[PDB]
C-alpha cells in the first residue's frame, strides 16, 4: 500500500490506512469497515470540506501522504 493515509472519526480517533492513489473511495469505506465496525452505508468521508463520491479515487480528491480524511457518520444512519 504505497499511499498511507488516515481517517479521523468524531471522537478524534485517527485510523491509518494503506491504499493506492487509484484506490476508489468505495473501497476505503470498506478498508475502514474491516478495521472498525462501521458499515460503508453510515460513512461519509470528508476531505477539505468536500464529500467524497464512492465511484471515485483518492487521486481525484488530490489525496496524498499523511493526508487526513474525516469520517462523519450519517444522521439517518443509526
Amino acid at each position: 500500500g504505497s499511499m498511507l493515509i488516515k481517517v479521523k472519526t468524531l471522537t478524534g480517533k485517527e485510523i491509518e490506512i494503506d491504499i493506492e492513489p487509484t484506490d476508489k473511495v468505495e473501497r476505503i469505506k470498506e478498508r475502514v469497515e474491516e478495521k472498525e465496525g462501521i458499515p460503508p452505508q453510515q460513512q461519509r468521508l470528508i476531505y477539505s470540506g468536500k464529500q467524497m463520491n464512492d465511484e471515485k479515487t483518492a487521486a481525484d480528491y488530490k489525496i496524498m501522504g499523511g493526508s487526513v480524511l474525516h469520517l462523519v457518520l450519517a444522521l439517518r444512519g443509526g
Binding site: L10, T11, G12, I46, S48, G49, K50, H70, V72, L73, L75, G78
Partner: protein
C-alpha cells in the same frame, strides 16, 4: 432544484448577463426565473457563499458593462434585500450602481475637459473603495508609457472636483483594446492590464524569444499572476490560433519554468468560414479577485463546512444515545464530544439545531420550549 450555494449564484449571472439563456427570453420570464432563486436561498447553509459569488459576478458585468437587463440588475437589488439578505450588503451593491452613473457623468465630463491617447480612446470609471473592492494586497505591474502618463493626468482631474479623496488604481479590473500588427494582418485584442504588460514587453524586441524569468523582470508581475496571465495568452480556451507560442509545452501553468521561452506568434489570425481574415477583433478577458484570494476563502469555507458537519453530527449523536435532552445539558456536552475536534461556538450550534429541526431530526417538546426530543 439546484442545491449548491454557488451554482445558485452562477445561475443569476447566467440570467443577468448577455448569455444564450438571457437573450432567448423576455424580461417577464427572466424576472420570474430570478424571483424563484432568492426564494430557495432561505434553504441554503450559509447564504454568504452566495453573496460572495454573486457580488463577484455583478462586478464583472458592471465593469465590462455587459449587463443584459440594466433595469433588473438594479431591481435585482431590492428583491435581494426583500428576501432578507444582510443590510450592509444590499445597499452596498446599490452603491455600485450609483458609481457607474456617477462615473458615466464623470467620464463624459473628463473627455470634454480636454480636446497619451485620443479623447474617446480613454474611458474612466471611479468607484467607491469600500463598496466594490475586497482583498487589498499590493499588486505590481509595469505600465507602458501611454497608460502611465494618463494616470496622473486623471489623478489631477478628480482633484479639483472632490478634494480630500485619493484614487487608487485597480489594474485587475482595468481593461482595454490593443492593436496587434502580425505578419498576416492587424487585429484588435480585448485585454486586462496584466496582459497588456506581458505583450508590450515585446515591443522593443518584436521577434525575440523572452524567457519566463525575464518576463518576471520586464513585467514585475508576481510569479503566480504571471503564470496565469501567460497561460491566458498561450492557451485561451475556444481559440483557434494562439497569440503567444510558448516553448517546452506543458498542460498546466504550474509546470512553466525559468527557461520556458515565449514568442509572438506571427501566424496569428482569425478565421471566418475557413477563410483567413486579415482584420479581426477578439476578447481575451474574464478576471478576478487576485488568485491568492481564491485559495484564501476556499481554504476557510471548506473548514467551516467541516465544523458545521461535525457540529451537526455531534448533536444527533448525543440525541441518539439519550433521547430527550435540554438545550442546557446539550450545550455542555456538545463541547465535550467535540473535545478533540474543535470548540463549537454557540452561534454555529444554534444554527445547526434549527437546521436539524426542519429536516425533521429533532423536535421541541410542547411541555418545554427548550429540551429537544430525538425524532425518527
Amino acid at each position: 432544484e439546484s442545491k449548491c450555494p454557488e451554482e445558485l449564484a452562477n445561475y443569476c449571472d447566467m440570467l443577468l448577463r448577455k448569455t444564450p439563456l438571457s437573450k432567448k427570453l423576455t424580461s417577464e420570464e427572466i424576472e420570474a426565473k430570478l424571483k424563484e432563486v432568492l426564494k430557495k436561498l432561505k434553504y441554503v447553509q450559509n447564504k454568504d457563499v452566495f453573496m460572495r459569488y454573486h457580488k463577484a459576478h455583478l462586478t464583472r458585468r458592471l465593469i465590462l458593462d455587459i449587463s443584459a437587463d440594466s433595469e433588473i440588475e438594479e431591481n435585482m437589488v431590492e428583491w435581494l434585500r426583500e428576501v432578507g439578505m444582510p443590510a450592509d450588503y444590499v445597499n452596498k451593491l446599490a452603491r455600485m450602481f450609483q458609481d457607474i452613473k456617477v462615473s458615466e457623468d464623470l467620464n463624459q465630463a473628463f473627455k470634454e475637459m480636454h480636446k497619451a491617447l485620443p479623447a474617446d480612446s480613454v474611458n474612466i470609471k471611479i468607484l467607491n473603495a469600500g463598496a466594490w473592492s475586497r482583498s487589498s494586497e499590493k499588486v505590481f505591474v509595469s505600465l507602458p508609457t501611454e497608460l502611465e502618463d494618463l494616470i496622473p493626468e486623471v489623478e489631477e482631474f478628480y482633484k479639483k472636483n472632490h478634494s480630500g479623496r485619493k484614487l487608487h488604481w485597480h489594474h485587475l479590473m482595468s481593461n482595454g483594446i490593443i492593436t496587434f500588427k502580425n505578419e498576416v494582418g492587424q487585429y484588435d485584442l480585448e485585454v486586462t492590464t496584466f496582459q497588456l504588460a506581458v505583450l508590450f514587453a515585446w515591443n522593443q524586441r518584436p521577434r525575440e524569444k523572452i524567457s519566463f524569468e525575464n518576463l518576471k523582470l520586464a513585467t514585475e508581475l508576481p510569479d503566480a499572476e504571471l503564470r496565469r496571465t501567460l497561460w491566458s495568452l498561450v492557451a485561451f480556451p475556444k481559440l483557434k490560433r494562439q497569440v503567444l507560442l510558448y516553448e517546452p509545452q506543458v498542460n498546466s501553468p504550474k509546470d512553466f519554468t525559468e527557461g520556458t521561452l515565449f514568442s509572438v506568434n506571427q501566424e496569428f489570425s482569425l478565421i471566418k468560414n475557413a477563410k483567413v481574415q486579415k482584420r479581426g477583433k477578439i476578447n481575451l478577458i474574464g478576471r478576478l479577485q487576485l488568485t491568492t484570494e481564491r485559495m484564501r476563502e476556499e481554504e476557510n469555507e471548506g473548514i467551516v463546512q467541516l465544523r458545521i458537519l461535525r457540529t451537526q453530527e455531534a448533536i444527533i449523536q448525543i440525541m441518539k444515545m439519550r433521547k430527550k435532552i435540554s438545550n442546557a445539558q446539550l450545550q455542555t456536552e456538545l463541547v465535550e464530544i467535540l473535545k478533540n475536534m474543535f470548540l463549537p461556538q454557540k452561534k454555529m450550534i444554534k444554527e445547526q439545531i434549527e437546521w436539524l429541526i426542519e429536516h425533521k431530526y429533532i423536535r421541541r417538546d410542547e411541555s418545554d420550549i427548550n429540551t429537544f426530543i430525538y425524532m425518527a
